[PDB]
Design a protein around this ligand. Structure first.
Ligand SMILES: *[C@@H]1O[C@H](CO)[C@@H](O)[C@H](O)[C@H]1NC(C)=O
Ligand SMILES: *[C@@H]1O[C@H](CO)[C@@H](O)[C@H](O)[C@H]1NC(C)=O
Lengths: 50, 50
């Protein structure tokens, strides 16, 4: 449930590695990680691969 | 189970908003919505973002 709670919060700004981890497509510093662990996250334009 | 039944039926012609809702990438009128609620849906070329 944490895995999906987090996947839904993170949407497409991350990729699943298939081993229980999410890799970010943007620099995610302590302040970001602190946001991911609770009810918030918003990083709208970090696609490079698109 | 409805969330996934619907996600599988809708595939990539929709996006998950992460709050229990699916946003369509195409105009989806009453006739479409009536199809989504039961065993049918087929909208092959509505990507704009691709
Ligand atoms: C969520 O984490 C951020 C970052 O540390 C913090 O500012 C915010 O107050 C926290 N929200 C709750 C409800 O704890
Ligand atoms: C599914 O919904 C469509 C649209 O209203 C309808 O035409 C079709 O007969 C319905 N199928 C079933 C099995 O109810």
């Amino acid at each position: 449930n944490l895995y999906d709670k987090v996947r839904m919060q993170l949407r497409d700004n991350v990729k699943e590695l298939g081993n229980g981890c999410f890799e970010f497509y943007h620099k995610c510093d302590d302040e970001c990680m602190n946001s991911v662990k609770n009810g918030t996250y918003d990083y709208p334009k970090y696609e490079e691969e698109s």
